Every structure is written in C-alpha cells, then in structure tokens.
C-alpha cells in the first residue's frame, strides 16, 4: 500500500519482553520466520487455526498464553523436521539429535 519511498517502524516482539526474554523471543522469531520461509500457508494455518485468538491492531503475532506459545513452538518447530524429511527423503527416525537441532537452528 506504499506508493512512495518512506521509513516505517514496526515491533517484532509485540509485548514479549514482560513474559519472555529477548534471547528466547528472537529465537522463536527466527524459527517462526523459518517456517514462513518453508511451509508458508500451513504455518499461517497454525496461527489462524483458532480465529477466536486474533492479531491485535498494533501488533504482528496473535497474542497467546504461555502454554499456547509453547505448544506453538512445538508445532512450528516440528514443521521444519517434517519438511526436511519430505523433500530430502531422510526419515526422522534415522537422524541424530545434532542434525535435528542444527536444522531447526538452521
């Protein structure tokens, strides 16, 4: 919607600083953006699965509770492993933890 060159500021963390440290907040940012790099619309469906939790006006990520953010970290995390196995044709049950943590981190 921007037809003109301009600077615009945004907020990644919404307010995650109260309940979540910047380390872990940026880490979950990196993971979420990896699934947005890879899975795209499905990772979106994990956000919009329950529409009764809506994205706020100021913010970017829809506001969940701590347990919900954790379970979302589980689903979103596992997405990268699933797609790894799909395209690379390498079963997850044949994998060593170093490779799983590496792929999820990168």
């Amino acid at each position: 919607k921007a037809t003109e060159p301009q600077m615009v500021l945004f907020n990644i963390y919404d307010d995650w600083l109260d309940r979540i440290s910047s380390y872990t907040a940026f880490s979950r940012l990196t993971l979420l953006l990896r699934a947005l790099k890879t899975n795209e619309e499905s990772a979106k469906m994990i956000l919009l699965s329950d529409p009764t939790i809506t994205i706020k006006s100021y913010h970017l990520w829809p506001s969940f509770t701590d347990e919900q953010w954790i379970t979302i970290e589980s689903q979103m995390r596992d997405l990268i492993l699933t797609e790894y196995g799909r395209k690379y044709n390498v079963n997850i049950s044949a994998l060593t933890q170093t490779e799983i943590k590496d792929i999820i981190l990168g």
């Binding site: 469906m45 919009l48 699965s49 329950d50 529409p51 009764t52």
Partner: protein
C-alpha cells in the same frame, strides 16, 4: 466470528468470502452442536480446515471482540 444457524449449529470461524445471499467461505472452522437422543446431555464440536456455507442456514452472525 460466531454464527447462529437454523439447525442448532454455532459456527465459530474465520470469514473469507461474502455475497448478497450471505453465503460464506470459511477457514479455521469450529462448529458447535449436541448429538443427543433424549434424555441425554452431550456437548460436541469439530474442527474443519476449509468450509463453504449456504445463507438460508444463517440466522444471526455475531462478532466477539
């Protein structure tokens, strides 16, 4: 948003499409009803990914902020 329906179905879902007839394309769909042959009390609900809807069904749509 939530929708009330002729057949006692509370449709909590994300709206995608809209028209004259109030037909709707729906994502993140979560219906609510009760399969119950009397006397009985059960409360059931199912998730559906994508779902088209017909307008005669719709009684009252509502928006919970």
């Amino acid at each position: 948003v939530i929708i009330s329906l002729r057949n006692n179905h509370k449709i909590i879902a994300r709206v995608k499409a809209f028209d004259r007839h109030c037909n709707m394309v729906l994502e993140n769909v979560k219906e609510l009803w009760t399969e119950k042959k009397g006397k009985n009390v059960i409360n059931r609900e199912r998730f559906i990914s994508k779902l088209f809807l017909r307008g005669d069904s719709v009684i009252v749509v509502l928006k919970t902020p």
